[PDB]
Design a protein around this ligand. Structure first.
Ligand code: 1Z6
Ligand code: CL
Length: 468
């Protein structure tokens, strides 16, 4: 009797699972919104820092109308190799944001020390991928890595149709601080990561005026064998592909159809992505250089450390944000923590979602979100940056682990505006000029020097309809 091999694994549920971490795929949590959960882990924040001198160059006549296609191809080539490294070393990629990603090794406290060693080896191996690498004949392309460790809270919020999750807490804020101390080729350890790590393994140098450390070397003891040590470490990794599935990058590739699980997983994924997953849209339709308006919403909390307070506040803000965005077919593309503030990357004019007067509407939506969230219990400050122009849209990452993302100078500008101009709604010159709304709706702002942005152009506050 024949025994044909190679099981089917290309189900819709498996395609949806590529867009999600194991944290969600295998999460099995309660129906309530918000849901909060508490654990320990190691975080890795990887930034690709060459990928700016190419995005706006991919929008040039050089690329002959295939700018977005060439951009996503070369980015995915490089990001895919980082993803395979994280997955093989047992990490869970939480989220992609442009040419950057956050990964998690979740583990019980007693295993943090050994898991840190695994995450350090992974990090140096990621740097090794880029040792003699270039984008074009002249531009290097290297990464910066921040590592943090300790207590981590997960927040899941949303409504009956949409879900979003966030990691929160001091380790999360730590990994961002560690990452932006990093220079090209660095691995920076947060102060608590350094306090928790196996110091007999790792040669460090001090970071001036910082308690965070830079890794110089991983110098193993005489009888140390990384492969055997890694094997011992997989004992504590719930979902590490093993045995029969030792050849897979993710246990999620083995997901079987399950209507209840699929209903729950699809809530995290945009409808245009689901349409492609269902073979009802061309697989390449979402890769594009596209004019859009970014509405970047930051919420700062009265107690920035009180996870139990911030959960309901984010839930309340989200409930109103989603209802305002729906009206103009605007989308939440990402949510993440930024200076212990909750940030919503909102996008107007996505594929099949472009509607006229996009600019007037992004501004009125921003103000609507601003007025409501300002009155949300425990929200201390609302800040909104609005910028409009050509941005890259596309699915970024590896075949087994990828997310739809936006990349471009206007994305970074809206993010810098909400941080540098807190407590107000700001917009760039494109939005101001193209709103045609009368000038007295705006206030022209002092020019601030903003990290990463070279000549923002004139910036404005959206003052609104009245003097009050
Ligand atoms: C999210 C995201 N997707 N693409 C770019 C970003 C980003 C995130 C934070 C930030 F400060 C500036 C840009
Ligand atoms: Cl997050």
């Amino acid at each position: 009797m024949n025994t044909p091999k190679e099981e089917f694994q290309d189900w819709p549920i498996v395609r949806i699972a590529a867009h999600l971490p194991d944290l969600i795929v295998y999460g099995h949590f309660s129906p309530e919104r918000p849901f909060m959960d508490y654990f320990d882990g190691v975080l890795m924040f990887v930034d690709i820092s060459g990928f700016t001198a190419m995005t706006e160059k991919f929008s040039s006549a050089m690329y002959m109308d295939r700018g977005a296609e060439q951009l996503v191809e070369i980015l995915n080539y490089h990001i895919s190799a980082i993803v395979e490294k994280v997955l093989i070393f047992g990490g869970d990629i939480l989220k992609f944001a442009g040419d950057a990603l956050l990964a998690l090794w979740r583990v019980e406290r007693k295993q943090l020390k050994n898991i840190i060693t695994v995450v350090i080896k992974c990090s140096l191996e990621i740097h090794g991928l880029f040792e003699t690498q270039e984008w074009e004949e002249g531009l290097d392309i290297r990464v910066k890595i921040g590592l943090a460790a300790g207590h981590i809270s997960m927040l899941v919020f949303g409504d009956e149709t949409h879900s979003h999750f966030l990691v929160i807490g001091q380790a999360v804020d730590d990994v961002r601080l560690a990452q932006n101390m990093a220079q090209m080729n660095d691995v920076i350890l947060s102060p608590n990561c350094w306090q928790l790590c196996d110091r007999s393994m790792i040669e460090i140098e001090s970071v001036p005026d910082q308690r965070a450390v830079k890794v110089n070397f991983l110098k193993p003891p005489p009888n140390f064998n990384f492969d055997e040590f890694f094997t011992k470490c997989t004992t504590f990794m719930h979902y590490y592909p093993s045995g029969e599935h030792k050849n897979l990058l993710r246990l999620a590739c083995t997901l079987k159809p399950d209507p209840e699980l699929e209903m729950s997983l699809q809530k995290y994924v945009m409808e245009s992505i689901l349409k492609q997953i269902d073979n009802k849209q061309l697989q390449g339709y979402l890769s594009e250089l596209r004019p859009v308006t970014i509405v970047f919403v930051n919420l700062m909390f009265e107690d920035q450390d009180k996870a139990e307070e911030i959960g309901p506040a984010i839930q309340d803000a989200y409930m109103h944000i989603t209802s305002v965005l729906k009206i103009f077919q605007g989308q939440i593309n990402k949510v993440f923590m930024f200076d212990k503030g909750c940030s919503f990357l909102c996008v107007f004019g996505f594929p099949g979602e472009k509607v006229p007067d996009e600019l007037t509407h992004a501004l009125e939506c921003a103000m609507d979100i601003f007025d409501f969230c300002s009155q949300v219990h425990k929200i201390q400050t609302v800040s909104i940056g609005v910028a409009s122009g050509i941005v890259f849209c596309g699915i970024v990452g590896h075949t087994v682990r990828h997310e739809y993302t936006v990349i471009g100078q206007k994305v970074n500008l809206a993010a810098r505006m909400m941080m540098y101009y807190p407590g107000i709604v700001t917009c760039d010159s494109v939005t101001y000029n193209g709103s045609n709304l009368p000038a007295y709706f705006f206030k022209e702002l002092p020019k601030k020097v903003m990290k990463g942005v070279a000549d923002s152009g004139p910036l404005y506050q959206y003052w609104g309809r009245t003097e009050k």
